[PDB]
Amino acid sequence: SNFINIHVLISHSPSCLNRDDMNMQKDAIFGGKRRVRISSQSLKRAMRKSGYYAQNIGESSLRTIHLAQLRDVLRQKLGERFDQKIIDKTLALLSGSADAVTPWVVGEIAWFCEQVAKAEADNLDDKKLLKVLKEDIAAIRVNLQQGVDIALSGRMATSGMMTELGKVDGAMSIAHAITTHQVDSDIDWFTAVDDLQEQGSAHLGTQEFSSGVFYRYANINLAQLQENLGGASREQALEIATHVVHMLATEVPGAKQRTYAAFNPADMVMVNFSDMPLSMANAFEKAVKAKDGFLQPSIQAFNQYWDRVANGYGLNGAAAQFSLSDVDPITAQVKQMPTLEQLKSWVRNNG
Amino acid sequence: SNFINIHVLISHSPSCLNRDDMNMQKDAIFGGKRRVRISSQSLKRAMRKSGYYAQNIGESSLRTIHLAQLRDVLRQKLGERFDQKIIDKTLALLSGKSVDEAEKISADAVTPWVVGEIAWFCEQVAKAEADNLDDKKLLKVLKEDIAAIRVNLQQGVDIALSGRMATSGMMTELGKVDGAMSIAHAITTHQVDSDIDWFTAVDDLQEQGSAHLGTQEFSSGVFYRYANINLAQLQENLGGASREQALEIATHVVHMLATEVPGAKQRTYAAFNPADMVMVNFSDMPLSMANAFEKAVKAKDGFLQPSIQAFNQYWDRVANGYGLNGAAAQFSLSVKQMPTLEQLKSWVRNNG
Amino acid sequence: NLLIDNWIPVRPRNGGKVQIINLQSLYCSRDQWRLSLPRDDMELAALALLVCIGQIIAPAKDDVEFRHRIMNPLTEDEFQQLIAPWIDMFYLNHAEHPFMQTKGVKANDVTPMEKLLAGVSGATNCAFVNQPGQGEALCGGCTAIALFNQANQAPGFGGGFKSGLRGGTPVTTFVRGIDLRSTVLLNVLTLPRLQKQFPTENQPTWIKPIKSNESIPASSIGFVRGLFWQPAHIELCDPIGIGKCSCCGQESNLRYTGFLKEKFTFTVNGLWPHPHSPCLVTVKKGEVEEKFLAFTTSAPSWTQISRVVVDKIIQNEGNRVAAVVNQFRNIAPQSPLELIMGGYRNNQASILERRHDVLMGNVINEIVTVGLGYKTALRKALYTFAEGFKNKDFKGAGVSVHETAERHFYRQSELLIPDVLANVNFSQADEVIADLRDKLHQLCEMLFNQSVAPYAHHPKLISTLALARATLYKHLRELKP
Amino acid sequence: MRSYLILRLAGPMQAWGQPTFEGTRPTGRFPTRSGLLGLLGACLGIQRDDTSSLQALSESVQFAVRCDELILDDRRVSVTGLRDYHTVLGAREDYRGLKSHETIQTWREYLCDASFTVALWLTPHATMVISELEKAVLKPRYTPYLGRRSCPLTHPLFLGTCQASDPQKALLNYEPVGGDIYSEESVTGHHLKFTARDEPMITLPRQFASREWYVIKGG
Amino acid sequence: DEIDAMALYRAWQQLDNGSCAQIRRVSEPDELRDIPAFYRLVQPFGWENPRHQQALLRMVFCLSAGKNVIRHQDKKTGISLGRALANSGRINERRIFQLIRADRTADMVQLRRLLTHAEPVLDWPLMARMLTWWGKRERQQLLEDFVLTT
DNA sequence: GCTCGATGTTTTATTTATT
Ligand SMILES: [Zn+2]
């Protein structure tokens, strides 16, 4: 299959992990009922800026892209629109035996080739060209040393990219996190006591906060990941996928965490392969009612939903489920995992 | 490891340690059930104002919005070290507010101040105007080295642990501190239906009946305190302290989190209970155990035993599942077995 | 030259491919055209430009000739006759008097065309959210249109740049015809009404320039000087070769790539009687004051029927219709009247919103009326909450809740509209309108509760809150027949 | 009778655009023509610079959207709207270089509890065949989503295939029946029209020309 | 289908001294399940049907405040409970806050205490509807009526 | 390559109910 589906159930203690311009908890109406929400961008940032990400994705081995090795395939690809003089001049001034090439690299380099061609036509060179294109070159260089970050998460907010081909979507897609149950949020009426004020406090306020059993969903386009890694292998893509699983299972937005401290890990992590990526959010369309907590009924509802619809929805294919609870499991079609690591290794070996 | 995780299970006899706008107990919905709550700000202020904190860590910062009263205080304290003018201008530079002789001068918001930090600052201001250096360039120069100012935060550790922001004045650029620690609201491990006390106030000049009839919410509870110290950040916020100093501070935080209880209604409910269970754990990234109590602890010869048991079970589930192997010591009383809190504290002092 | 060459972007009323025609082909044929551009607001700017041109080159002498010219196109001869001196007034690239430009602009850098494209730039999120390079090469037509739109509808570039005579961001209100020609002719004042409207220096601001830091009585501006007013110092750069217009995607021989601008202030005391915008009449002391209508805190607009929303807001809420509309009323009082309307909502120099209905029965009017009814209910309720919030010495966004709630209202109700439109007919009208009433009642309750939500557990505000909600229901009660 | 391809667009949140050049990213009530062309274009491996096959898809396929009310426990659930306060840290200040703003703001509208059923057919001079479109929606190359990448699908894109006279009958074959249908092809007893500006001007990247749906109400 | 609240009111009103005395000494609503007189009181008003059970527990508690504490007074909507509590002029606003913020069973105790203090004159079937539902909306409404009246 | 500072414009709608 081409897609990796990652499903996570994770329970948070009383906190406020994502708010709006009125400092109110982000929410969403699902199944006619209010669910507390953690926005996709907040979750994905929580991943992308994390230390784990920086160590395993940021400092990856396929990180650096060498323009040297890319000379030939570039030479043909752009060879139809540009001639080898301009191509090699461009490549050499940028840098100062590869099979395929990442599309955004081809695009940006092609733009640079347009620029140097138009630079030769007008009759110009030297520090003139190298001052007009100083910032641009700096940009493309910094990006050329961040290939895995760009392949997985997409180009940064301020990238320097200049072509339609340089609009790099991430390989991973992260849905908004929503609670599996209805939530009426709590209010914290707080005071700020002045050490110089005898009567009363110096400030008064309220803070909205709530517990919640969240359902995170994310999927990974393997093909696109390989292709954006310069034609890497399925296995390397599966390593990256392993990392994504880990982060989606452990990483939590730092919003309001200094004071509410909801540092909780996932109680359930499932991964399955498919040709069509699907969210199991409809397992909670009818809001989960609490029976000795919201966690167990949530996992149970997830399992029952999968058992009901997985066959018809064409979700046949490799599927593993790491879990901390002892709730009745899924169909036997899903391979049970006792540690997260065994699940990640299950992912490494193509399922 | 960079993170010190402090877990506390503490039982309180009937009391009311934290209430809201309508004098009712603070609570929180967890796992579909109501838990009594002690807010984190209450815990932090209870700690920073404690005798233990005063004896072992130092002076708590001075949090205020009243800049005039502050002006007067600083004048009274930094008077024999600086001339009044310099003190005034320094306050006026840090706050962004004009400090004259007004009866009432108000800052942008309640802000924590460290007297020593202010002293250092007005040293800098003195040496600034003496060298004919205007205020903007002074801001640049001071912006070039923030560690010193953070050693001035060594004189106000609660700001190094809990943080500080300012929206106006040079503080905006220089006093921006991200808290080192991190702490959760204390919630009970079980469902609570709070009791109500129907009381009367008897008048000694009124033979017939009472002079006041009223109600007061209260309850018993087995609270779960959690607090991890970030450590590298504690070193940064203290101006570049050693890991030993940060570890010792963390130790004091363990002792306080284990023993300190807000004074709310304690002169009439007196729930002076120490923690029955305390556990400290070193880890690469923070880990809270609140999901041990997501399913509310059902009573069984008390709420405390099943709470501790549930805590241990979930701890093992998490450690086995995520393969966590950071050093850990538990002190129990009902991973380590700590006959005494002191052994656990020394164990923490010694990097685990 | 706009009056001679092809620049008008059109496509047949119910036809296909876009072609570019000239003013004569428009004025002298029974061909049904409609403007065609990637942007509704640029279409409105185009129509506005054509209406102004027609207003200065061929005012009908009476209502009879007005109707006559509408039902019957001119001959080419009459057209040329009508356009000659005005031919001389309309040149994009000229020696001394370029169209709406100022020769001899002193500027260090060349301003990109994106600054003329009303929303492409102006804010930071603009750089983040918009497609880049929309204004790298603009044809002549797009340039003229953009200049006009910047002179009338859009806010100034920034500090030291002045806005139109109608203020920064005004709403433009035109009478809608069957095709383009008819629309242009329909929004042209007859000579008598033209005189009654403008009772002076009747020369363009790019021929007889404005003096720096001068005071100008509005009464001293000719109608062609005002209709083609130009408040900032702009001067196009030399064009480039044959290629695609980065704005409309069409091919063109001349494409402009940048311009020169400079700061230039003055003062126009009083209000110029512009015939293309409705206004608000306030009585202050004993004097009658007028202010042109603008999308201030919200831009009232439903899909499909925004023009009806605006029309009803002008008709019912002391708003006075635009001059061209008043004229059309007086010429054909028994005739139905639908608008072509447009405007922006803006933070200072940054556009925040665009609402534009440019297209070429009683049930819909009823629907709009109902909608606005519930809107007003909510706004009065939350303004009660707002004032109560202010008077209680509270600070924060508690005061401006009614505005946000209004905007939100328009959005959610717009989610409601398409089904309503789909089920409307003679027999079902009353039921779909009843259901609409229920839905809007619920939506008002929701938006009230939502806008008030951040002020829970504020014991004082209870008084305020109470009153507020009561007010809501009062009005809601008054909306059920 | 012609061959139709029936699709399903369900998920907790969706986003179908309206004209904008601002931080506000608005949503319509039902899927936009350009949005659908983009969904299909994502199922196929079409890059953003491949204007050729982009135009081929645009000139091969026409749509018909039906709005499906969510029924839960015999109770109807109405489609709600959602406003997302979406900020961006370190957003590009200009279209080149590396200078950035500290924080910028956007406001993005979503549809909640929304679900649609799309009917798809071929123009008389189409290039592709519904077979390969079926293969595409069964095994997409790029990740398909409902408007925005943060909007996953909870039901498989493929719902079915059938033959029929008009899109209304084809859609009649698939529950839940009764939703309002917005089609690019007329239908006898119905004359309503829904103007919109979502016909993607392709030769002019990211631009939009006007067009009109044929509105056909449900019983 | 709907509980005849006035019939329950008159029923409670002409109840013998004994049965009444037995229902009165209850200290929380659920304890009414221990009193046979309660069942004999509410049986004709649909007690053997659960929804009615909860509603009737609340109603009969509030009535158990005493025979002469809730004065029914016909409509001229009718005097709501909040309005009545305010009209008494005995009840502090803070107590109304503490009432509407309270949780299950506690809310009924506090309400009965309030009723005992105010001795309110109100439209009883109205309050009966309120007690039937008693959601968050009803409690907020209680508070806001009370405030608007003062 | 910037930070500086003066500067283009313009706002107001209320005020007692009862699922
Ligand atoms: Zn053009």
PDB file of C-alpha atoms (C1' of nucleotides) in Angstrom, chain F:
ATOM      1  C1'  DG F   1      20.217  47.252   5.804  1.00  0.00           C
ATOM      2  C1'  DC F   2      18.262  49.338   8.779  1.00  0.00           C
ATOM      3  C1'  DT F   3      15.522  51.835  12.770  1.00  0.00           C
ATOM      4  C1'  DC F   4      13.483  56.621  13.411  1.00  0.00           C
ATOM      5  C1'  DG F   5       9.264  59.385  13.537  1.00  0.00           C
ATOM      6  C1'  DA F   6       5.566  61.913  11.761  1.00  0.00           C
ATOM      7  C1'  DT F   7       1.583  60.440   9.118  1.00  0.00           C
ATOM      8  C1'  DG F   8      -2.550  58.842   5.009  1.00  0.00           C
ATOM      9  C1'  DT F   9      -7.916  57.788   7.725  1.00  0.00           C
ATOM     10  C1'  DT F  10     -11.902  58.224  11.160  1.00  0.00           C
ATOM     11  C1'  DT F  11     -17.294  54.785  15.435  1.00  0.00           C
ATOM     12  C1'  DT F  12     -22.706  54.342  16.286  1.00  0.00           C
ATOM     13  C1'  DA F  13     -26.263  51.493  16.611  1.00  0.00           C
ATOM     14  C1'  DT F  14     -29.297  49.772  24.395  1.00  0.00           C
ATOM     15  C1'  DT F  15     -31.548  49.693  28.298  1.00  0.00           C
ATOM     16  C1'  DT F  16     -36.441  44.065  31.310  1.00  0.00           C
ATOM     17  C1'  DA F  17     -37.523  37.959  29.406  1.00  0.00           C
ATOM     18  C1'  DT F  18     -39.365  32.854  30.450  1.00  0.00           C
ATOM     19  C1'  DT F  19     -37.121  26.798  26.438  1.00  0.00           C
TER      20       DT F  19
END
